[PDB]
């Protein structure tokens, strides 16, 4: 089941939509979520700029506009107790921590393994982590659920926007309960996400 | 009719340990736990399988190949895998 | 190829090591042309 | 969609044993069996029942090669018959023994043996007594060679026999063998054993 | 659920057809799977020979024809893994090991108490297990499931046939993958095997 | 409208091999191949894709003339099979090879080799890497000749091999060869070329 | 005018077919045909193998089947004079011209920038360029016409081969009337190629 509708929006068709294999089921990278652990976020556009046929339209296309599949799984046993939020923030500007630092491209746009999170509790935004529940969101309990399901639509002022040079909305996953094991226990549990991007549409076929 | 493939065909493997693939809790995430090759005439592991056996009667042979994985793990472990095929002419992928 | 998406988690007190068994068939697209002789002989 | 059927599978002459004249024995029998030799014995035992027509073809010639205008005799035991024990014994002239009368000149002689076994169809893995486990239901005769002759010629002679299947039928596929071979018991090497697969160098390369 | 129709044959009618206690369900000694094991075989008229009702009749009569409802169960608990095939093999004929021994009756013909398989990999008859999946199987996962059930009718070339000479077809029982466990876990744990006669008949009563 | 037809234009044997045997290497083998002899080499060409049946005749001859009923085994060895190495070499007795035995006072042997190439047609020009441009495509099988003897004789032999094509459809027509060849690939001298046309006195002369 | 269908034949459909940009016209680079020129050829698989949409998808795709619209500009004045064979010759194998050399790949496979004829006469195959008009072809003769289209399917024996180690057919273009001019003219004219692959289909999607 699991499943969620973000804003109650689903993907859609207003340009090239290839829709053959740019549809398909990109998966990422696993996370070690450890017992120091504090955090994951993925900018989607960027998330995909490198994986094959997404990538080749993405970055050879000056216009792009599409919803997403997620897909969030995390593979834990019966021993192991811990909670996740995964949100899905539109527009999530990772902000600096300089009491002016700019951060930079590894932390802005971090690519398919994703950036952790500086400051949990503030987002690295300044927004406080409680209210983070506002997003389109999904709770993932080690006690009763692994898959969390978010099907977000094209989110933008704009119909198209580049996909190289600006993020659609940013995919956090949180330990708002760090994650504890008893002895012998596996000491790090993956966490994974498959991407499935509903309805592409590209224009702009730059070289 | 499936057959079990003989994918732990290295050396230093006794008899019944020939036909598992050793999955470990000791192994990172993004990483080759193993791979085979998909022609059956050729030796390899499925020289052990009953299709491999057979299209060794003939010479030529053209078809879609069924191919399962069994896990015998505890039911308490879980985990994740991801099965991969390359198609002909493609060399074995260095990454996941 | 088989590849270690994620890990093998394991509870506490259970082996840290299972096994994956495969297992090969055709279907009903294969056609075998021209008998042979074998070499396993 | 036809040279994958049984009956095309085991349709194909070929050589079943080698049987030597020396005409100083003067004589030389052969009991019909299939597995006399590896490649056709690999073969039947891949399935557990079996009903087929032998027909039996016998390429007789001369230690050079040159052949003589000889007179030769084929005669077929069937099981139960006495086979027989000189040149000149009395079991040759048994008109219930079906012979065959070909010079070394004249092309091979070829016969055909039906299905006669006692039971409904043959089987060379009996489980049980009557390794051992070797089952009578399976014998289909005997073929024995003399050159007739009011006198003993000095003739010296080496027949081979061609034996091929037809209308036959198969039950119960099972295993084709992987261990070497050791007559009528599926004896193997408890030391030396094959492994079904060439050895590589590691499990994770494909080649 | 796991049924399992052998050949999609059932065990059928043509003698005395008993079908009174001759069809209840006979329970053999549970088998005790250790880390070290090597599997066990079965075969079954032999089975039977001696328990009660059915080995009254067997032993006593001089033909016989049945089927046979199979029920292989291993109890063991979810912190341990391995894998057993169950496979029947019709006319498992037990083969010698000399690099010409001729085993012995305690091999062959193992009674109810069943014989350990000296070499698994070559299944004792020289042929490669991996292929021994193509008879009438079924996998028994610790992780999946613990009952296998497998229908067997009557196969062989003759309609009827002795009970206390000839075997049937073997069941084996096979733990491909070797049983592992923690501490202070059961270390051997068990493997019960239920038969049901279906469709028995008997006949040529003997003393 | 008969004698211009593909069928007509490449239907008539001719000799396509000279095979010599001297049974002191004892055997002679012969690779099935159009592009032997000039004259066919030069008609088969003049198309790219055909698409046939072969007929084989074998006029074996001794070194005089004269034939002692020796007698001959012709064995067809399809691609893929090992072809024979020795006078007794175990690839004789494979009953998967057809072989043909004829005695040398026999008529010649006559065989028919059906289109089996693993494509829908026959190619000699093949523009690409699998000159070079070799297609592995049309192998057509092997020839293999010995004398059946118990010993080896010292009769010396001379074989000729005559082949027809029927059923036999052509596709693609290009032109037909002038320069000399030099055995399956298109080599031409470049300093030494033929014009197609001989050299007159003048072009206002017609003669 | 000047429309050509090669064989009567439409190039066609039957895989993944994208037919949006990979239909468009590709137009390689002018050759400038001197009074001294000999002739250029394009193997046209590798022609195209790295242009854009169609390079991408033939280099990782295994398998792949289409037809070409072809289109020969030669754009010449009404001072110039000069004629201009263009045929598509399928499985052009180029020869080598040893009086055994085996070219190379500068010459079999040539790429988008075409590679010129040694000996035009002998079409570097060792077939006489008079005879070449039996390939579907047309000419261009300063005088009359400019432009020479023709259309060739798919021509193959087996429906889908890799366009990357197997030429289709190989385009020519061959001034058997050497060009002509006075003093002051463009003393080299440009020839101009578009490609069209109509119906093209993709298979085998490698990295």
């Given at each position: 089941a699991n499943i969620v509708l973000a804003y109650g929006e689903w993907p859609e068709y207003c340009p090239t939509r290839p829709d053959v294999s740019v549809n398909r089921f990109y998966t990422l990278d696993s996370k070690m979520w450890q017992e120091n652990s504090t955090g994951w976020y993925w900018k989607f556009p960027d998330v995909l700029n490198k994986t094959g046929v997404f990538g080749q339209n993405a970055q050879f296309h000056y216009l792009y506009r599409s919803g997403f599949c997620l897909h969030v799984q995390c593979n834990a046993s019966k021993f192991h107790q811990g909670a996740l939020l995964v949100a899905v923030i539109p527009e999530f500007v990772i902000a600096g921590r300089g009491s002016a630092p700019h951060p930079g491209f590894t932390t802005t746009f971090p690519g398919t393994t994703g950036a952790t999170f500086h400051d949990p509790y503030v987002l690295d935004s300044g927004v406080p982590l409680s209210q983070a529940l506002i997003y389109p969101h999904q709770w993932i309990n080690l006690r009763t659920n692994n898959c969390a399901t978010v099907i977000v639509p094209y989110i933008n002022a704009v119909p198209f926007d580049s996909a190289i040079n600006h993020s659609n909305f940013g995919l956090i996953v949180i330990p708002v309960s760090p994650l504890k094991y008893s002895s012998g226990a596996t000491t790090a549990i993956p966490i994974t996400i498959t991407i499935a991007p509903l309805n592409s549409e590209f224009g702009g076929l730059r070289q | 009719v499936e057959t079990i493939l003989?994918?732990?065909?290295?050396?230093?493997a006794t008899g019944l340990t020939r036909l598992l693939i050793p999955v470990s809790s000791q192994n990172k995430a993004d990483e080759l736990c193993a791979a085979f090759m998909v022609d059956p005439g050729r030796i390899g592991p499925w020289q052990s399988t009953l299709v491999g056996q057979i299209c060794r009667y003939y010479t030529q042979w053209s078809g879609s190949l069924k191919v399962t994985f069994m896990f015998t793990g505890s039911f308490m472990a879980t985990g994740k895998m991801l099965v991969a095929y390359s198609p002909p002419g493609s060399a074995q992928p260095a990454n996941r | 190829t088989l590849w270690y998406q994620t890990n093998y988690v394991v509870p506490p007190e259970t082996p840290g090591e299972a096994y994956i068994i495969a297992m090969g068939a055709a279907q009903d697209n294969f056609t075998l042309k021209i008998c042979k002789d074998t070499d396993e002989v | 969609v036809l040279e994958t059927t049984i009956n095309h599978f085991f349709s194909r002459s070929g050589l079943v044993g080698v049987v030597n004249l020396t005409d100083g024995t003067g004589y030389a029998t052969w009991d019909i069996?299939?597995?006399?030799?590896?490649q056709l014995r690999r073969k039947c035992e891949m399935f557990t029942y079996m009903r087929f027509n032998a027909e039996f073809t016998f390429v007789t010639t001369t230690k050079n090669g040159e052949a003589r205008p000889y007179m030769l005799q084929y005669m077929y035991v069937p099981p139960g018959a006495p086979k027989p024990?000189?040149?000149?014994?009395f079991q040759w002239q048994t008109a219930t023994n079906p012979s065959v009368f070909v010079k070394l000149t004249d092309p091979p002689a070829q016969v055909s043996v039906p299905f006669?076994?006692?039971?409904?169809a043959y089987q060379w893995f009996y489980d049980g007594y009557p390794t051992y486990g070797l089952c009578p239901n399976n014998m289909m005769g005997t073929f024995a060679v003399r050159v007739v002759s009011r006198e003993a010629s000095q003739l010296k002679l080496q027949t081979r026999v061609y034996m091929k299947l037809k209308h036959v039928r198969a039950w119960v596929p099972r295993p084709i063998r992987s261990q070497p071979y050791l007559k009528n018991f599926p004896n193997y090497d408890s030391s030396k054993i094959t492994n079904s697969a060439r050895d590589r160098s590691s499990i994770k390369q494909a080649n």
């Open positions: - | 003989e994918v732990n065909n290295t050396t230093e | - | 069996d299939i597995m006399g030799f590896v024990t000189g040149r000149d014994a006669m076994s006692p039971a409904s």
